[PDB]
């Protein structure tokens, strides 16, 4: 089988500015090669076919060229919702065959997170489990350190985080990160704290709680 | 226009066999092939063979054919899909996509099919409010939320008041607990305001379990 080698694998750029990605193929494949946009959540959508030709209602800042096995994407002018993980795909040989894809980040001006914190529901608490959720929101760039305390002392092994893909529109972050205790343990103590560390902050920031 | 309906997510024990379905409308379903992909971590973008309805004919990737089989049935529009012997390694999301009679590139695709391989039991989540308060304020707006707890498998769908509220929304990505149970988060920024005049319900379905849950999420 044909394989596809896209680079790079990440690229970083800021809104207005030109992206470039290329792929090769094993060996050639005429003009046989499409590119794809994958934007989180979403089947990919065909942009370039035989290489070089803008399918239906693709914007013109969206082109291909290369013949044989060297392929160029480019995006003259990024713009933030041009987050996507790019593919390119031939169907010259069988069967076809995709590139690894680039991953499309955008680069955008420091933003602080704003924190929130939340206790366990009443009802939660039913269940014998209590979960305690700190919530960072609409930060950039990505880098954050989230601790708990609880009176003070450090937590270690019982909390978990998740983080959204870039937003789209403003090309931040949101970052949760989840806090589980027995109701048992919820209830021995008082104090709830999360700590955020982050670099559109000049020291870090700590959200509280007094459980009652 | 075109449209490629797949069928919904589905937990698979390892060694069962699974069926799933792509129904096309907007076009004349008997004249156009249909092709399958596979999208996982592993090995990202698949191709695993193609469907053409008007004479029957099958083309499989020979690395797909001893598991994957291929049929149609005209009469409802709709192409299947069946995988045998299922391991870990065929837990990916399985789209059918479209050509454009120009060679094997895709046009339309399906939404997709999230299929898991596990030996965990089906669970629908528990769905908690994360109320507002003053240590979720931040100048005339606050954050709320709810939390989808301990459920199995992938996927869970949320939106907030039926769709009516989609600015400042967050749905996490699900993490897999120790418990080897997904969990999640859905959170939402609104003016504090609106706290006492419009009322803030999550919608939360699990069509592995067949649920959908509603909570409404009030200052506690």
């Known amino acids: 089988d044909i394989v596809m080698t896209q680079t790079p694998k990440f690229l970083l750029v800021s809104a207005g500015d030109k992206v470039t990605i290329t792929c090769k193929a094993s060996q050639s494949v005429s003009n046989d090669l499409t590119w794809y946009q994958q934007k989180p959540g979403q089947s990919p959508k065909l942009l370039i076919y035989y290489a070089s030709n803008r399918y239906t209602g693709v914007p013109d800042r969206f082109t291909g060229s290369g013949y044989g096995t060297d392929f160029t994407f480019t995006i003259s002018t990024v713009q933030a919702e041009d987050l996507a993980v790019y593919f390119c795909q031939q169907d010259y040989g069988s069967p076809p065959t995709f590139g690894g894809g680039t991953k499309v980040e955008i680069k955008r001006t420091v933003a602080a997170p704003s924190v929130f914190i939340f206790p366990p529901s009443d009802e939660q608490l039913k269940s014998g489990t209590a979960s305690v959720v700190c919530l960072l929101n609409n930060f950039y760039p990505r880098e954050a350190k989230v601790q708990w305390k609880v009176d003070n002392a450090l937590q270690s092994g019982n909390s978990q985080e998740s983080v959204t893909e870039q937003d789209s529109k403003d090309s931040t972050y949101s970052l949760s990160s989840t806090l589980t205790l027995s109701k048992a343990d919820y209830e021995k103590h008082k104090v709830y704290a999360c700590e955020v560390t982050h670099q559109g902050l000049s020291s870090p920031v700590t959200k509280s709680f007094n459980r009652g | 226009q075109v449209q490629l309906q797949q069928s919904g997510p589905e937990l698979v024990r390892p060694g069962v066999s699974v069926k799933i379905s792509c129904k096309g409308s907007?076009?004349?379903?008997?004249?156009?092939?249909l092709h399958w992909v596979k999208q996982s971590h592993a090995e990202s973008l698949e191709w695993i063979g193609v469907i053409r309805p008007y004479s029957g004919e099958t083309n499989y990737n020979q690395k797909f054919k001893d598991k994957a089989t291929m049929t149609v049935d005209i009469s409802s529009s709709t192409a299947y899909l069946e995988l045998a012997r299922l391991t870990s390694e065929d837990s990916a999301i399985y789209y059918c996509?479209?050509?454009?009679?120009?060679?094997?590139?895709?046009?339309?695709w399906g939404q997709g099919t999230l299929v898991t391989v596990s030996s965990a039991s089906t669970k629908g989540p528990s769905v908690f409010p994360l109320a507002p308060s003053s240590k979720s304020t931040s100048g005339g707006t606050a954050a709320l939320g709810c939390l989808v707890k301990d459920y199995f498998p992938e996927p869970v769908t949320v939106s907030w008041n039926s769709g009516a509220l989609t600015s400042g929304v967050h749905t996490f990505p699900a993490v897999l607990q120790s418990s080897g149970l997904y969990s999640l988060s859905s959170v939402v920024t609104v003016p504090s305001s609106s706290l006492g005049t419009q009322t803030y319900i999550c919608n939360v379905n699990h069509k592995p379990s067949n649920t959908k849950v509603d909570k409404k999420v009030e200052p506690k």
């Open positions: 996509a479209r050509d454009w009679e120009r060679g094997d590139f895709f046009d339309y």
């Open positions: 907007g076009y004349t379903f008997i004249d156009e092939a």
